[PDB]
Every structure is written in C-alpha cells, then in structure tokens.
Amino acid sequence: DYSKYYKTIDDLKNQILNLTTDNANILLQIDNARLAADDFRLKYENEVALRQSVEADINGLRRVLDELTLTKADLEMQIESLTEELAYLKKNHEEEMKDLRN
C-alpha cells in the first residue's frame, strides 16, 4: 500500500542520518589522530636532534681527553728529567764540601 512505500522511505531517511553522523564522527577521529601524530612527531624530532647534539659534544670531549692525557704523559716524563737534574746538582755541591774537608 501507499503507506508502506512511505514507511520504507522513513526507515531509509533515518539510516542516512545515522550513517552521515557516523562518518562525521570517524572523520573527527581521523583529524584528531593526525594532530596527535604531529605532536609525537615534533616531540621525536626534537629528542633526536638533542641526542645528536649531546653525542657530538661527546666527540669534543673525546678529543680533549685524548690530547689531555698526551700532555699529562709529556709532563710526567719532564718531571723525571728535572728531578734528575736536581739530584745531580745536589751531588755537585756535596763534592764541593768534600773539597772543604780537604
């Protein structure tokens, strides 16, 4: 009957509304998902670039530690040659005293 055609049409209207809103909701879920991403992205980019910067400053620290221990070693050897020069001067004076007792 005429009325039945009506009834279908109404059922179908309601479906369109349910499906339209449902789609809209999903889309919003997408937009918010994109945004959340972008946040995590920027956050990661900055964490990386940091890790890099610290590791490079570490490269610097390695270089200066290496040269620094080189200089340390050099100085040590010079302290030995100089403590030597000292002792030898002491002995020189001692022999001068051996002359005094003469």
Partner: protein, 107 residues
C-alpha cells in the same frame, strides 16, 4: 491509481545516496586504522629515542667526569713542574755563590 512509479524513482535516488555513504564509511575506516598504525609508529620512535638520548646523556656525564679529574691532575702536575724548575734555577745560581763565598773566606 498511479502513485508508485514516482515513489520508486525517489527511493532509487535515495538508495544511491546510502550506497555512497556506506562506501565512504569503509574508506574512512581504513584511513583511520592506517593513521593509528602510523600513530603507534611515531609513538614508538619517540619512546625509543628518549631512551637513546638519555643513555647518551649518561655516557656524556661519565666522560666529562673523567675529563674534569684529568684537568685537575694536569694543573696539579704542571704546577709541581713549575716548582721543580724554578727551584733548579735558584739552586744553581745559589751554589755558584756558595763556592764563591767559601773560597774568599778566611781559612
């Protein structure tokens, strides 16, 4: 009577709109799931990389401690060298003076 054919026409147009809306839905389901897969990827890259950066922070702290210590020593030792050498120069000229004095001393 003769009402249906136009009803049928309009219903067919309607069934067209609903078909499109269902297809759209499916597509948005897929794009959402794909964006979630991407979100979890970016989240993991993040977490993993803050662990990476933090362990790099620690490695740095340790090497810098070693450097600080070694500067401390180097300046200590360099200073001690300065002491020994200065003392050398002094003692040389002095001892020359000691011999000079002993010599020209009333026996």
């Amino acid at each position: 009577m003769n009402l249906e054919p136009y009803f049928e026409s309009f219903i067919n147009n309607l069934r067209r709109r609903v078909d499109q809306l269902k297809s759209d839905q499916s597509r948005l389901d897929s794009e959402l799931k794909n964006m979630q897969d991407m979100v979890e990827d970016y989240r993991n890259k993040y977490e993993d990389e803050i662990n990476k950066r933090t362990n790099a922070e620690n490695e740095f702290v340790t090497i810098k401690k070693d450097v600080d210590g070694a500067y401390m020593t180097k300046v200590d030792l360099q200073a001690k060298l300065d002491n020994l050498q200065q003392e050398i120069d002094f003692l040389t000229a002095l001892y020359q003076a000691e011999l000079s004095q002993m010599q020209t001393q009333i026996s």
